[PDB]
């Protein structure tokens, strides 16, 4: 085959060990081309992790391995990390395509990190988007493992579907996740309620917040 | 330090043309050659090609080549990616990076932080940014209030936020963001720490909208409705 393949996900629990395997073909690693392994962390751009088939860049934990055949290859992480989470990438060079080639990428993820319950604050409109004639309540939740809520609207105890946009969750820098919901009403609506609530719900509780529209008069 | 830095986000119309750039600086510009990679959304990482950053001789991928040019500029330690006739699939993060021997091959030693081109027929257009607070701008009691900037209305991704204590960049939650119904995008960002009392004008939210060359600061919360 002249392109490299690999698992679209593995996972570990944290301190075990997991390996990323990177199948070629005749054209590529059965030439006699070495694999280079890189690491792309969320939101970042990939970084040199192993080069030729087992050498560490300066900086790079020795918690990452190498081996290459002239089949597949195969990244080893041992002891892993919550901070490992990314995407892993093999490459090499394939004579057929006269051009160097790339693996679809491996998602890392690391299970069993410690359960941490979200943290939510419900925002009212501002005053100058009311002045636009537009009312957006705003429902931030962060630093919560694992990265799975569901997120309910309430117009006072009425629960609300229409208008509502919510994010899936994103890891933060501290290993922790995020995400966000939006309630978009008419001035009208937010007027005519006594208060609107943002529940968030994870694992076994709910959490829920609450705004009302004379709270800062 | 060796570092590889890219112009900013690009819009295109499909059939149009896009050129990026990668300035190197730590090191000597003409002693190790430039690859170009691409990445899709829900595609692997795509080699583009590589130039000779002495001597500016190219190779490309067979993907690519009858519309893409690599060219350099060694007064500027710059390399640049022209890609024509852009279509849907050409929406993409595009990196540089630099080459580097080793004894039995070549790897990619350091990239770029890569730049967003994207295609799209659609009008571009600058977010709209409202100061938002959980809780009142003046507290009656000694609980704290939460900071956040609601950025709103633009056209394409992405916006990038710092906010400010003064002169001092200060610590922020980042949150994705989500395309409305309208199509535009919007996107919320938080101040992290909780604030008591302030000066007016003391903390300011900074959003830049590369694609549409604008930055907005508010610094402003004003008193509740
Ligand atoms: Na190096």
């Known amino acids: 085959q002249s392109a490299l393949t690999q698992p679209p996900s593995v996972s570990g629990a944290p301190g075990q060990r997991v390996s990323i395997s990177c199948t070629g073909g005749?054209?590529?690693?059965?030439?006699?081309?070495?694999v280079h392994w890189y690491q792309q962390l969320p939101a970042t751009a990939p970084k040199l992790l192993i080069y030729?088939?087992?050498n560490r860049p300066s900086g790079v934990p020795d918690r990452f391995s190498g081996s290459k055949s002239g089949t597949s290859a195969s990244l080893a992480i041992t002891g892993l990390q919550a901070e490992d989470e990314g995407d892993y990438f093999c490459?090499?060079?394939?004579?057929?395509?006269?051009?160097?080639?790339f693996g679809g990428g491996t998602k890392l993820t690391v299970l069993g990190q410690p359960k941490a319950a979200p943290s939510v604050t419900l925002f009212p409109p501002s005053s100058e988007e009311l002045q636009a004639n537009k009312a957006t309540l705003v429902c931030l939740i962060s630093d919560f493992y694992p990265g799975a809520v569901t997120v309910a609207w309430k117009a006072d105890s009425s629960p609300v579907k229409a208008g509502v946009e919510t994010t899936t969750p994103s890891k933060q820098s501290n290993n922790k996740y995020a995400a966000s919901s939006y309630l978009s009403l008419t001035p009208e609506q937010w007027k005519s309620h006594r208060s609107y609530s943002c529940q968030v719900t994870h694992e076994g509780s709910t959490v829920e917040k609450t705004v009302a529209p004379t709270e800062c008069s | 330090q060796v570092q590889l830095v890219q112009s900013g986000a690009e819009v295109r119309n499909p059939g149009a043309s896009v050129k990026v750039s990668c300035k190197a600086s730590?090191?000597?510009?003409?002693?190790?050659?430039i690859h170009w990679v691409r990445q899709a959304p829900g595609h692997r990482l795509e080699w583009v090609g590589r130039?000779?950053?002495?001597?500016?001789?190219?190779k490309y991928s067979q993907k690519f080549h009858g519309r893409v040019a690599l060219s350099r500029d060694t007064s500027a330690s710059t390399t640049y990616m022209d890609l024509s006739s852009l279509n849907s699939e050409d929406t993409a993060v595009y990196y540089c990076?630099?080459?580097?021997?080793?004894?039995?091959?070549?790897?990619?030693?350091?990239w770029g932080q890569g730049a967003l081109v994207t295609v799209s027929s659609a009008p571009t257009k600058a977010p709209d940014v409202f100061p938002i607070i959980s809780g009142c701008r003046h507290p009656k009691d000694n609980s704290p209030v939460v900071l956040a900037c609601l950025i709103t209305g633009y056209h394409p991704t992405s916006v990038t936020v710092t906010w400010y204590m003064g002169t001092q960049s200060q610590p922020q939650r980042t949150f994705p963001e989500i395309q409305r119904r309208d199509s535009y995008y919007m996107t919320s960002s938080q101040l992290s720490t909780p604030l008591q009392q302030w000066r007016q004008g003391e903390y300011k939210c900074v959003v830049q909208h590369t694609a549409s060359k604008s930055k907005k600061e508010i610094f402003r919360w004003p008193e509740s409705p």
């Open positions: 130039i000779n950053t002495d001597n500016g001789n190219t």
């Open positions: 730590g090191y000597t510009f003409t002693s190790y050659a």
């Open positions: 490459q090499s060079f394939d004579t057929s395509l006269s051009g160097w080639i």
């Open positions: 990076a630099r080459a580097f021997y080793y004894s039995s091959g070549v790897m990619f030693d350091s």
């Open positions: 030729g088939n087992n």
């Open positions: 005749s054209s590529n690693f059965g030439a006699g081309y070495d």
